[PDB]
Amino acid sequence: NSFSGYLKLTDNVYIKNADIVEEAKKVKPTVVVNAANVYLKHGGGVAGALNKATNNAMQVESDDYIATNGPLKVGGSCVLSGHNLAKHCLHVVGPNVNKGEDIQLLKSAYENFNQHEVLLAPLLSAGIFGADPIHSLRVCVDTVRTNVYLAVFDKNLYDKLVSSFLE
Numbered sequence: 195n196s197f198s199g200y201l202k203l204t205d206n207v208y209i210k211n212a213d214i215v216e217e218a219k220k221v222k223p224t225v226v227v228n229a230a231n232v233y234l235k236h237g238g239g240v241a242g243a244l245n246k247a248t249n250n251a252m253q254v255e256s257d258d259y260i261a262t263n264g265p266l267k268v269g270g271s272c273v274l275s276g277h278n279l280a281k282h283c284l285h286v287v288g289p290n291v292n293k294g295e296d297i298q299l300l301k302s303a304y305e306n307f308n309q310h311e312v313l314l315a316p317l318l319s320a321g322i323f324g325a326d327p328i329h330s331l332r333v334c335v336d337t338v339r340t341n342v343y344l345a346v347f348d349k350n351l352y353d354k355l356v357s358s359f360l361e
């Protein structure tokens with residue numbers, strides 16, 4: 195858990211302008227969070243990037259999990275192998291408000307982080323999932339009680355998030 199160059203926002207939330215994949219390779223965290231969908235199909239965005247960094251091992255394991263257990267619920271999660279990126283990957287489904295899912299489920303989504311003492315994570319429901327990223331950061335800060343290190347791979351968004359937190 196050798197996190198470096200983060201800005202501490204609260205006693206348990208840290209943030210950095212970084213690619214979560216590159217962070218996972220450097221840090222070797224105990225848990226990396228995947229911004230997943232309910233069928234664990236890592237087809238693009240940050241899920242596709244984490245899967246590609248495992249040379250598709252994450253996708254094969256995910257397909258096997260879905261066959262036995264069925265899909266996740268929106269707001270839910272599962273723990274699978276971290277492969278070469280972490281000890282464990284916590285696959286979390288935030289709501290996709292661009293597809294009509296309820297933004298209130300973002301609190302349920304961040305509540306999954308509280309089962310793990312230290313996590314490397316992306317900003318849930320942001321990007322093409324359509325949530326307001328400032329609102330996602332506020333829900334993270336108000337919900338997560340364990341130690342979370344947020345990697346946001348966009349300097350423009352990072353600066354807007356920090357300037358909002360510090361108002």
Ligand SMILES: Cn1ncc(-c2cc3c(N[C@H](c4ccc5c(n4)OCCO5)C(C)(C)C)ncnc3[nH]2)c1C#N
Nearest residue numbers: 213214229239240243316317319320321322323345347
């Ligand atoms: C080809 N490639 N290599 C690396 C990455 C990469 C993306 C990425 C990231 N994306 C954030 C995010 C966060 C929650 C998302 C989402 N995206 O997409 C819908 C699902 O929910 C965002 C957009 C807000 C900055 N955040 C952190 N590290 C990251 N690495 C990619 C891609 N794509």
